[PDB]
Ligand binder design. Sequence first.
Ligand SMILES: NC(=O)c1ccc[n+]([C@@H]2O[C@H](COP(=O)([O-])OP(=O)(O)OC[C@H]3O[C@@H](n4cnc5c(N)ncnc54)[C@H](OP(=O)(O)O)[C@@H]3O)[C@@H](O)[C@H]2O)c1
Ligand SMILES: O=C(O)COc1cc(Cl)ccc1C(=O)NCc1cccc([N+](=O)[O-])c1
Length: 315
Amino acid sequence: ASRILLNNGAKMPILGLGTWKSPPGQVTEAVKVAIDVGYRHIDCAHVYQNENEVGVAIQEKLREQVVKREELFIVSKLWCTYHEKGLVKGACQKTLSDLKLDYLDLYLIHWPTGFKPGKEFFPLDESGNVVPSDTNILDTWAAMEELVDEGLVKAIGISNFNHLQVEMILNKPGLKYKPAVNQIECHPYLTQEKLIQYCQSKGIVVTAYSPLGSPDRPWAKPEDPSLLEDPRIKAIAAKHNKTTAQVLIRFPMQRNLVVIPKSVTPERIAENFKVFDFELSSQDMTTLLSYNRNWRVCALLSCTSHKDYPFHEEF
Ligand SMILES: NC(=O)c1ccc[n+]([C@@H]2O[C@H](COP(=O)([O-])OP(=O)(O)OC[C@H]3O[C@@H](n4cnc5c(N)ncnc54)[C@H](OP(=O)(O)O)[C@@H]3O)[C@@H](O)[C@H]2O)c1
Ligand SMILES: O=C(O)COc1cc(Cl)ccc1C(=O)NCc1cccc([N+](=O)[O-])c1
C-alpha cells in the first residue's frame, strides 16, 4: 500500500519529501518535481525557514490541477520557542499562511524541549546553554488538541519523544486526542527497535527521519559513519539492482514506518520515489538491522541539561 491508516482515521502516504536544508531558491522547484513524479506528502517545519517557498510550489500544483488538496498530506512542526499555550495557535497560523494552506494534515511538537520565547530559535545564556521554557509537554499537548478542535489541523503528533515522554502524553489526565505520529531519527545505524515497537503497540505511527544519514547535516565530521557509502548496504542494493538510497528508503517502509528522504536534486527526487516495486527479504531486513550502532545525526549539546532532553534515557 502507498498509505498507512492513522488513529485519527486518515491515511498518510508512507513516502514523503523532506525539506530541512533545502535552499529557499531551490525548494520550490524541488517540491514541484516531487509532486509531478508522485509525491503526495511533504515534511515541513517553521524552523527550516523555507515554508513560504515550499508553499509556492504546493499552490502552483493545486492551481495547475496536477493534484487536489485532499490528495496531499502536508506536515509541519511547532518550534521549541512556541510551546507556551498562548503562542501555539499563532505559530500554527504562520505556518499555514506561509504554506498557503487552510489546514495541515499533521502538526507535530517538533522537540519535547521548550525554549524561552523570542526572535531567537535557540535562545542561549552566556555559557551557551539553551534557555528553557517552564512549559511542560502535557500543557503543550492540550494546546495542540485545541488546533484540531478549531479545524486548523487534521492530526497532531510528536517528534523526538522518548518512550517515557510518549507514555506521559498517553497517560495525560483528560487526554482528548492521542498522538497520531511520533517522528524520530531512524536508519540502519540507529534502528530504534524498542521505541518503534512501543509506539506501534499503542497505534502510533512512526515516521523515520534522516533515513540516508543526513549527509548534508551542517555538523558532519570525518570520523562519522556513512550509510550511503557502507559497502555492506551497497551490496544489498547491487543484489536487488537498486541504488543504496532506494534500499535505505525501502528498509523503513517494510517496518511499517513512514519515511521522508530529503533531496533538491530532480534525478534523486524521482529515484527516491521508485521504491514500491521491489522487496527486501526478511534476511536482508535482519541484516540491515544488525548494523545498529546507536549513532545519531540529531542531538544537541546545548540542550543536554534541559529537563525534557530526550536522549539520556535508553529509548
Ligand atoms: N523531526 C525532526 O527533528 C527532524 C530532524 C531531521 C530531519 N527531519 C526531516 O527528515 C528529512 C530527511 O532527513 P535529512 O534531511 O536529515 O536527511 P536525509 O534525507 O537522510 O539525507 C539528505 C541528504 O541525502 C542526499 N540524497 C538524497 N537522495 C539521495 C540519493 N538518491 N542518492 C544520494 N544522495 C541522496 C541529499 O542530497 P541533495 O538534496 O543534494 O540531492 C542530502 O544531502 C528532513 O529533510 C526533515 O524534513 C526531521
Ligand atoms: O530539528 C530538526 O528538524 C533538524 O535539525 C535542525 C534544523 C534546524 Cl533548521 C535547526 C536546528 C536543528 C537541530 O539542531 N536539531 C537538533 C535539536 C533541536 C532541538 C532540540 C534538540 N535536543 O536535542 O534537545 C536537538
